[PDB]
Chain A
Amino acid sequence: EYMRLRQLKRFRRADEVKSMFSSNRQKILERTEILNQEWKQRRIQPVHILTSVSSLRGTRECSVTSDLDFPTQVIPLKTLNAVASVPIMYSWSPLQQNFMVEDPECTPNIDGPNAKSVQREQSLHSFHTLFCRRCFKYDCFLHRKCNYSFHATTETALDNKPCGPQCYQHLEGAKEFAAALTAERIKPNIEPPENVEWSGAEASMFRVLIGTYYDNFCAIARLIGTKTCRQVYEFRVKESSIIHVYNYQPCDHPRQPCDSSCPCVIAQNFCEKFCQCSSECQNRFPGCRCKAQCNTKQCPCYLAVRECDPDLCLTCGAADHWDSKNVSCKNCSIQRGSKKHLLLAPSDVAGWGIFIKDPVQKNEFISEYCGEIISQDEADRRGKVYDKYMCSFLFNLNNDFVVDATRKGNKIRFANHSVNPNCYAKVMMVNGDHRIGIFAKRAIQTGEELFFDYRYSQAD
């Protein structure tokens, strides 16, 4: 019964393994034949293995006391020169922006011959589910939010006359029909329509484009394939006949003030451009109108420990000349990505140290302490793993965010410590995101080993 079937399966498997072993044996037999042929292709210089000399330099000689009955052999110890060692470290992943480490199925594609019509949750389901308006990325790793979406789920003039070819509105008695149909969604089209086959892909594309464009017909005909505008009106008629500082989390609620009922208010944070609330929202941060350099406590962004959003602060300089060096506003250099070059050398205190090649003045950006975002609990586990070998790189960014740059960081992770540091750390919220910026405490001259007070961080 079952035992017999198991025995038969075992016999078949044994035959299979024997057969594969034999076949690989034949292949490896040919390969080892050519290998031994290559081995016998060329000889080698006769290694006499002469017993060196008899104390050529008059140094210590070897004592090879053979355990078996043989005389002890003596050979001078030919000492070899030594080489400079190197402090220990592990491999690391280069990086320049933060990385949040994680802690009937669908419709067919219009591409290809196989296409149809499907508008259950409209025809736009794949490109609307995975999205991130902040970084413009599909299923991004920077903003690993809840992502409630899952499983890939206006006035204009009338186009009178037949624009190019025959237009829909130029047809005798159809514009008023379109107007009446639009009004009801809260002479006229009496002529019989044409009969042209419409494919599923064309139907879906026309439906989506009309839903997003509405009354316009010449343009939709231009962007569609064939699709005579009169036929467009015909389908339009027929379809109706058929039927403690946190990052700025955006809020979407049109015609709704943000006051005691908004997550931005609950977090004591201003609504940013990504927020979809009313343009006259109470919590909206007014763009500071600095003349330049945004480095005085005068600017509300500077006074409240914040950077400058290019959408709000226009004349401050945080938006103009995006593709350039650090902007005039000195409160937006973290977002721009411009920093100072750091070098690596054996530290004069212990281990390795980051040695800046250029001098940095008082309160100046040096580099961003990037890494991988992990929650406080994941920060605890990662820090324990790193401290297993007694070298931690954990740093605090926000209340519930911690940057750890052991497995993935930059050259700024090799920061030494003293009671009198030459540098200090200050976190600034850039474009609704928190990014640590390293600042020099005093006028640092060229090429010295840097410092940073560990007492500021969680790991002191």
Chain B
Amino acid sequence: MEVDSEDEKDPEWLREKTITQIEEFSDVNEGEKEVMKLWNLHVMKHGFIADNQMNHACMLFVENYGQKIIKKNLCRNFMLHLVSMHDFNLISIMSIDKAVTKLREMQQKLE
């Protein structure tokens, strides 16, 4: 009776279904599919609804997944996806620069 809430914003079956739907695309690229799955899973697992924090959302990718992006070598796909938001507003050029610089350390750390 302590907590036993049994409520979860991102249940396991939700993550599995999201991964399956992303990997089931017919007209997407391998790196594109990987980065799209990563971002969709991040959004579902964090439940971001705040618009301003959406900018901060672009920073959150560096906080946890940096090692995975370094290992998979998905810098170009991530940069393209990060650029592909100014058409819908949110973030800015400064946020893009900050995120690219933050990831650049990881690739340089591998380098």
Contacts and interface: CB of A to CB of B under 8 A. Distances in A.
A111 B77 contact: yes
Contacts of B25: 152
Q: Chain B binding site: helix, strand, loop or mixed by DSSP?
A: helix
A138 to B, nearest CB: 5
B53 A127 contact: no
A93 B13 contact: yes
B88 A108 contact: no
B30 A410 contact: no
A337 B9 contact: yes
Contact of A94 (B11, B50, B73): B11
Most chain B CB neighbours (cut-off 10 Å) among A137, A138, A339: A138
A310 interface: yes
B52 A137 contact: no
Contacts of B39: 138
B80 A127 contact: yes
B28 to A, nearest CB: 6
Contacts of B28: 106, 126, 152
7 contacts: A94-B7, A94-B8, A109-B29, A126-B28, A205-B79, A213-B93, A273-B51
Nearest to B74: A111
Q: Chain A binding site: helix, strand, loop or mixed by DSSP?
A: loop
Contacts of B100: 223
A151 B29 contact: no
A355 to B, nearest CB: 11
Most chain A CB neighbours (cut-off 10 Å) among B4, B8, B36, B51: B51
Given A94-B11, A139-B21, A152 B27 contact: yes
Nearest to B7: A96
B71 to A, nearest CB: 13
Interface size class of A (residues with CB under 8 A): 35 or more
A138 B83 contact: no
Contacts of A106: 27-29
Contacts of A139: 21-22, 40
A425 interface: no
A131 B36 CA distance: 10
Interface string B85-109: 0111110010001001000000000
Nearest to A109: B29
B8 A135 contact: no
Given A94-B11, A208-B80, 11 more contacts: A93-B13, A94-B8, A108-B29, A124-B83, A126-B36, A130-B36, A138-B36, A138-B40, A152-B25, A310-B51, A311-B51
Given A138-B39, A341-B3, A126 B32 contact: yes
A203 to B, nearest CB: 13
A110 interface: yes
Contact of B77 (A95, A110, A136, A223): A110
Contacts of A97: 9, 47
A276 interface: yes
List the 6 closest A-B pairs by CB distance, nearest first.
Answer: A111-B31, A109-B29, A127-B84, A110-B76, A152-B27, A106-B27
Interface string A332-354: 00010101010100000000000
A343 B2 CA distance: 11
Interface string B36-53: 100110011001111111
